Amino acid sequence: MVPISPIETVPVKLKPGMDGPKVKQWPLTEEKIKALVEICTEMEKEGKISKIGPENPYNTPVFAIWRKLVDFRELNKRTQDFWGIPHPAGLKKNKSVTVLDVGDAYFSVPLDEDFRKYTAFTIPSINNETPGIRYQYNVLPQGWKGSPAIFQSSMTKILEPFAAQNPDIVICQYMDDLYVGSDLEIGQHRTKIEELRQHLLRWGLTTPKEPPFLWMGYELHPDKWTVQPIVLPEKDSWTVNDIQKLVGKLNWASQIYPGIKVRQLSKLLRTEEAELELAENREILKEPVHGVYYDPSKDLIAEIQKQGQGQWTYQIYQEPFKNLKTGKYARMRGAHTNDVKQLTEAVQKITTESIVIWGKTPKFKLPIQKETWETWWTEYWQATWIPEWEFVNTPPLVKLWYQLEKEPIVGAETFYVDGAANRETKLGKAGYVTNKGRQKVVPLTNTTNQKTELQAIYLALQDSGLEVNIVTDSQYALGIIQAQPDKSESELVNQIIEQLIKKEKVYLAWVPAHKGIGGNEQVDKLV
Amino acid sequence: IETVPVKLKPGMDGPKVKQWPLTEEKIKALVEICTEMEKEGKISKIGPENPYNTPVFAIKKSTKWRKLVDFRELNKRTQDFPHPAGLKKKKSVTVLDVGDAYFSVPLDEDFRKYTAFTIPSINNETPGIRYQYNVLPQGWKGSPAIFQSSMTKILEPFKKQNPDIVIYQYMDDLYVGSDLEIGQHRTKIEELRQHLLRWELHPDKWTVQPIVLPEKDSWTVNDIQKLVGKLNWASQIYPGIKVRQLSKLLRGTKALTEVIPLTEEAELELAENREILKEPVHGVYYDPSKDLIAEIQKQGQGQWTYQIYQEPFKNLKTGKYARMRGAHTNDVKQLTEAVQKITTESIVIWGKTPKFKLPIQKETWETWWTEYWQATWIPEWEFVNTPPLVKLWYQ
């Protein structure tokens, strides 16, 4: 007998202060008992388990479905703590790719002796007239918390030297499988696969699929990758769970499939738009498309498009018309925002995803003028940055809709504005006075201070020329306008934006309230 | 040569922290470096029985890649283990990297499991390479605390030779203050370095910035409105600020560009305000127990302002930063260098790092800050999403 290379066990402890699980054995039928007796008998013959005595207080429940089912949930709760899927678009094209799934994975790796005492289970005897049969595991049990970690660690440990000895091949390892690949000749590749199988066999690991590979919702073909076909459930009544599943499926489809919109359906989990959206989604899922694999010798490119309503879409590719992958970005929840910020966030996201998948940052093609971005980042109070990028013109283009002056405008009328409201009666007033004598006060029902100050500014914008200076005492309004939203949840703010867009020059000054500063009248709106 | 027992806080478990994605070149550098460190027994591979993980990335101080470990979580979870106030009063201070010594001291066997880290793989094609430290890791707060005695015994003759020199130690860095001349300072630093082999900051050129008001022959309405706003702001800081006579000028409705002549009461009031602002701030103390807060504002054109305080409107220090090195086109690089400088100054003055409030979105900073970061330590930070009105008041 050629001696099998020994696998060194991983020391395992329970959680501190806890003891091993003790659970009464469930009553079972006679057939179940016989089946379990036979199974445990042949398993004991193979050396996966061993028979124990009364000295072990710990008991793990067991069922039969044959096939044995040991429930270690309690042991899992009392066992200690132990230490992302690969993305197809990140894979590199190889002339040959072989899959090797090791059988009897967990049962091929030994268990730490000092922990075997806790994996003890008992087979109920017939009619309960004799003591149940006692057993304990000698290898990694199926369903035990610590099995996969120890298994994969052992696997890596055994795999290191072969990988070191063969730089001309690439080996991936997910969980219980090995994915080998090379640009060698078919015979040489198959031979090296045989060698690997021999090397694994030395340590006592048994190994045996051909393209296309059905793996983790993906379909892997030699020259390309895609997703397994998406099935959108059709029912006249859509429940919350149905919408969650539909959102999950559409998100999963959105990686390869460009233009997938999920805003409405996700908004319903807090219309004609939603129906047309899902119909367009069924329109996109009509003719399937394939993604390609990654070539390190060519530049990595990500192009972004504004999809409207806080939605963005991006394509990652190296050559035109051939995508590596795609995706989308929904804007974060906020009261105010502009296109440039959302674009920046989207870029950040794509960047992180890229570094995860390809280990590098791609060059960006963005729908924004260099000048626009320049103005933005130079005048924006926050610090902001984007990596290397160039402007591609594919409307809608991201632009700055209005810009506030840094200095007061000469020849421009000066609108001193103010607004106030009564807290309990919700009654208020808003208006302005100017240096040319122009005044206005408007009374308002159902409002607050902020709304009346905003309203005052809006009034100043409505009744003024192409160039205007505006004085306000509101830190709130100035706070909103200094954030430069191009869109807002509040209709008033949107109207003010609409006013600013029409303006040529606008200077927005601020003064402290109730300091007796002339032209600033809190007295008109207090009545 | 012998391991001193190290434990954790009363009921705090070891750090489990997600390793963030690394670029390919950094992963390569870390692989090479950690291979070399594995050959020298500095670190050793571990199994799945170790749940704990601490983040790790790669920097450049020199074209050689350096290994940086984010020991923040471990430091705050590590159990609690004499600031030379004459260090900030010195003419010059030079910082040295004495981390290379830390790897000569063995680490307590029971604590190593907490210093576990993972070199990540691209696209998750293989499991990450996990290591644990066998010696004292750089970036851990316990390392200088443990090496403190040895460092004392090493630096004893140099300190006894010329006691015009202050010596402080923080993390992997060794601060040396003196009153000498830059050339003699560099020769002294060379002699100190070769003194450590056998075994450029100017603190006096910083101050606490006063609040200044404009001096003008003629004032526009806008000028006076800004003045009144600024003085009103300053009223929160200083007791005797009054603006009623200046606001008295603004009375009526006038164009922003119209020139308004100052009265005698207005000029007097303004002068009184100047005299008040020339004084320091009343009752400003440092509390070693409380936390240091650093606020930074972007002024544009490479200009950045900052304030270190503990209580609102009670600044322990204020400063500016306009230093331009290759950062002209990049805001985030600028902010990173600024945060570093501020943290260093804070280390010199109080012997500890402050908590920052960065004028940046979390996502941007979190994505890019590790590219420009040359410092062996790391501070804590939070993000201010609302624009401060007080920006130009510090300009």
Ligand SMILES: N#Cc1ccc2c(Oc3ccccc3OCCn3ccc(=O)[nH]c3=O)cc(F)cc2c1
């Ligand atoms: N079931 C299954 C499964 C199968 C294979 C997986 C996988 O192949 C690779 C393993 C090692 C190096 C390169 C590999 O692939 C690159 C792309 N690629 C794919 C298929 C093909 O036929 N040709 C080709 O070029 C990598 C992986 F990350 C997961 C895999 C999963």
Ligand SMILES: [Mg+2]
């Ligand atoms: Mg008001």
